[PDB]
Amino acid sequence: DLGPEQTGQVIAHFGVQVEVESADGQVSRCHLRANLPALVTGDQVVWRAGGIGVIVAQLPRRSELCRPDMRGLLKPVAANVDRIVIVFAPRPEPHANLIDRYLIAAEHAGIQPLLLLNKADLVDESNAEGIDALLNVYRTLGYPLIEVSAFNGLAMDELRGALDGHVSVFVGQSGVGKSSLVNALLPGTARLFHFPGGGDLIDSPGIREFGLGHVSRDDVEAGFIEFRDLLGHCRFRDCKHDREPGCALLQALEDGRIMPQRMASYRHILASMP
Ligand SMILES: Nc1nc2c(ncn2[C@@H]2O[C@H](COP(=O)(O)OP(=O)(O)O)[C@@H](O)[C@H]2O)c(=O)[nH]1
Ligand SMILES: [Zn+2]
């Protein structure tokens, strides 16, 4: 016995079994057919019913969020995420370095980012010279940025709007309010939840620690939008972009098409990779 084929999305992964939600808005547990590739939360599948179903086939993923293995290798932990929400705050102090890192991860994963200044209620006149400075570094790169407070409620209906129609992941250093933010947007391994205003979320303590490990220099360079356009124009195809004339990047910095705050963390980060 097996009912007809159906289209659905993966909600939870209970090892041998998988929680699956359909377009109808109904949930069912489905066993995993043997031949089937590895599945993660967010994946789109074909299944048949029987209250237990059988997952028959996996539909292509649009995107993948990976995470380091027990060994140290990257294995996917979520699928079909189209937005990564990078959350920082006035406290603890935000550094360009870690932000520039999460921005690279988002590029490596092939997923569009969205920066979030949480704890905007803590933006004193004292902080603003230092804060508006850093915000407008990513504002002038074309990146989406919102200033919010999961304490106040400041600009939360814009975030709910920014999250509408997307599948989103919440990522940032600990203590910026990731838990507080989820709870504010959802009052009551990777699991998938739906925002009441619209859009979905995939969450787990492991995905929250999602960031950047060791990669290639050419990966890192691709993580800088200013860079992507120029790379391959430095005359020296062997250019290291350091004291080298004919370095397109260098000329760009001079002209102001690269910001020194960025050209710095590029050096700091690349020199952290082996
Ligand atoms: N002042 C202020 N504090 C906040 C805000 N959002 C979160 N917090 C505080 O930040 C601290 C850490 O929050 P939490 O969600 O646990 O951070 P997480 O480690 O990133 O999940 C908590 O004590 C919260 O009260 C905010 O908008 N304003
Ligand atoms: Zn160069």
From Swiss-Prot:
Any one GO BP annotation for this protein: ribosomal small subunit biogenesis
Positions contributing to Zn(2+) binding: C234, C239, H241, C247
Cofactor(s), by name: Zn(2+)
Localisation per UniProt entry: Cytoplasm
Record-linked CDD domains: YjeQ_EngC
Record key words, sorted: Cytoplasm, GTP-binding, Hydrolase, Metal-binding, Nucleotide-binding, Ribosome biogenesis, RNA-binding, rRNA-binding, Zinc
Keyword Phosphoprotein part of the UniProt annotation: no
Cofactor note: Binds 1 zinc ion per subunit.
Binding residues for GTP: N118, K119, A120, D121, G172, Q173, S174, G175, V176, G177, K178, S179, S180
Superkingdom classification of source: Bacteria
Principal subcellular localization: cytoplasm
EC number of the protein: 3.6.1.-
An MF annotation (GO) of this entry: GTPase activity
GO (cellular component) term, any one: cytoplasm
Nucleotide-binding listed as a keyword: yes
UniProt family annotation: Belongs to the TRAFAC class YlqF/YawG GTPase family. RsgA subfamily.
Complex and partners: Monomer. Associates with 30S ribosomal subunit, binds 16S rRNA.
Stated name of the protein: Small ribosomal subunit biogenesis GTPase RsgA
Source organism per UniProt: Pseudomonas aeruginosa (strain ATCC 15692 / DSM 22644 / CIP 104116 / JCM 14847 / LMG 12228 / 1C / PRS 101 / PAO1)
Lineage per the UniProt record: Bacteria, Pseudomonadati, Pseudomonadota, Gammaproteobacteria, Pseudomonadales
